[PDB]
Structure formats: C-alpha cells, structure tokens
Design a protein around this ligand. Structure first.
Ligand SMILES: CC(C)=CCC/C(C)=C/CC/C(C)=C/CC/C(C)=C/COP(=O)(O)OP(=O)(O)O
Length: 276
C-alpha cells in the first residue's frame, strides 16, 4: 500500500542523494540535486523496483535502473518548465530550476541528468545481471524517451475539430508523456530482475494501463471536486474507462507469483481509487 511506496520511495531518495553527491563543479551539482532531490512521489523508480522483485530480482539489482528513470523524469520536468516550453515558475509548489539557477544552468542540469542516467545504469548495475540485459535496458530506456516515445508526446502537446480528433490526441499525449516512461520503468525492472520476454511484455502492458489510469482518474477528480476525458466522453464513460483500465492492468499480472504480485495489484487499485 502507500506504505510499500513510501518505504521504497524513501530508499530511492537515499540512493539518489548518494548517486549525485555535491562535488565539483559545485553549481551544476547543486542545480541537479535541487530538482532531483525535491519531493517527487517516485512512482517510476518504485515501479521499477517492484517489477524487478515481481520477477524474482532484489531491490538492489534494480536500484541503479530505478535511479536512472527518475533522473530522466527529473530532466524532462526541468526542460518542460523552461520559458520556451511550458514556462513554469512553480512546480511541486516550489521555484522551478531555471528560476533559481537560470535557464542556461537549467538546460545543462537536465542534459547532465539525462546522460548520467545512462552512465549510472551502465556502470552501477551489478555484474550478476547479464550484460546483454543491461544493453537491452539501455535501448528500451532511450527508445521510451526519444521521438517514438516521450519527445513525440511533447511535440504533439501544443493545443482543431476536437470532436473528430480530440480523443485520439488525448490518448496519444497521455500514452507518450505519461505511459512511455512508466513502461520503461516496469520493463527495465523486469529485464534487470531476470524476467522472461513474456513477463516483460505483461509488465509493459500493465504500466501502459496504469499510466492512462492515472490521468483518467485525475480528470474525474478535477470535475468531482485543457482537454479531458470528462469533456470528450462524459463523466460516466470516463468512470467506466478507468474501471476497464484497472481491470486490464490487473489481468496483466495473472500468471505471476501470488504473493509477489500484491504491491502491483495494490498500486493499480490505489491509483484507480484516489480520493484526493
Ligand atoms: C527525455 C528527452 C529526450 C527529452 C524530454 C522531453 C520533454 C521536455 C518532455 C515533456 C516531459 C513532461 C512534462 C512529462 C509529463 C510527466 C508527468 C506525468 C509529470 C507528473 O508526474 P508525477 O509523477 O505526478 O510528478 P512527481 O515527480 O511530482 O510525482
């Protein structure tokens, strides 16, 4: 439950602190840490860890990979927040990177977090993991985040007959800007933990489903307290869609070890039933 996530999130925080220490050049490291070590919920690295354990791995095996996906998540925010893109002065209720360090330092801090993600995944992953698996991890991670994946979502996310193309655009953006990196987290965990190719594909589909589910539920909450699921399919159909995503995510975990699969089932039904 929230306890599993809170506790794994805490171990991730400590790992991130350790992975990117303050050293020379100091400013750049401060700027990287400012953003990396802020208050993310850490869902991506925790899903990574969870996926590793689901397949019989241990948290320690996946921890470098988990840190990499969070570094990549962090760098995406840093760049998205720049004036030339979303122009966010605030995120997490705090000044954004470029507001504290300048746009220049913010771009560089994102660049160094992207590259270090790969350095860390490649260099810090235990030698018990077969290098073929680490190569695959590198490739999955890069693919998930470039032009087929995340960046595609960002270039599309610009704001048309919404009745002809609105739903298609909405699913596209969410699949690309949310599901893609959650898919990479789960896939990297499965890969690094020794999962079969079948197991990896079930984890990929699970992650896609809970990625869409997060956004559908967020939209329902927003109206029961921009283009949205309630606007484009109505609220009832939005609720039916979230329930079908919850079911589908659960169905993907059919066939895994009964005890091992609880934290993922708990995460699906938690995301699904968010009250706040
Ligand atoms: C990765 C490469 C190659 C370039 C980055 C391309 C960019 C700038 C993409 C846009 C990234 C973006 C704004 C993605 C949305 C991510 C998202 C779902 C953010 C909110 O997620 P939470 O998990 O709630 O955030 P916390 O970390 O605060 O928990």
């Amino acid at each position: 439950p929230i306890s599993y996530i809170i506790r794994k999130a805490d171990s991730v925080n400590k790992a991130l602190d350790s992975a990117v220490p303050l050293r020379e050049p100091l400013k750049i490291h401060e700027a990287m840490r400012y953003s990396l070590l802020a208050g993310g919920k850490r869902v991506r690295p925790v899903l990574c860890i969870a996926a590793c354990e689901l397949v019989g791995g241990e948290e320690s095996l996946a921890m470098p990979a988990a840190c990499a996906v969070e570094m990549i998540h962090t760098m995406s925010l840093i760049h998205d927040d720049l004036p030339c893109m979303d122009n966010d002065d605030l995120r997490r209720g705090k000044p954004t990177n470029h507001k504290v360090y300048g746009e220049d330092v913010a771009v560089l801090a994102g660049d160094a977090l992207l590259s270090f993600a790969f350095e860390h995944l490649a260099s810090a992953t235990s030698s018990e993991v077969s290098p073929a698996r680490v190569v695959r991890a590198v490739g999955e991670l890069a693919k998930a985040i470039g032009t087929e994946g995340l960046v595609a979502g960002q270039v599309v996310d610009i704001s048309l007959d919404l009745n002809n193309v609105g739903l298609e655009h909405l699913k596209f953006i969410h699949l690309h800007k949310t599901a893609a990196l959650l898919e990479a987290s789960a896939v990297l965990g499965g890969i690094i933990g020794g999962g079969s190719d079948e197991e990896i594909e079930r984890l990929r589909k699970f992650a896609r489903c809970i990625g869409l589910l997060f956004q559908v539920v967020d939209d329902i909450l927003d109206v029961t307290k921009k283009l949205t699921y309630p606007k484009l399919m109505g609220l009832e159909k939005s609720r039916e869609f979230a329930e079908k995503l919850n079911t589908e995510a659960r169905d993907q975990l059919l066939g895994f070890d009964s005890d091992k699969v609880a934290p993922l089932l708990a995460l699906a039904n938690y995301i699904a039933n968010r009250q706040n």
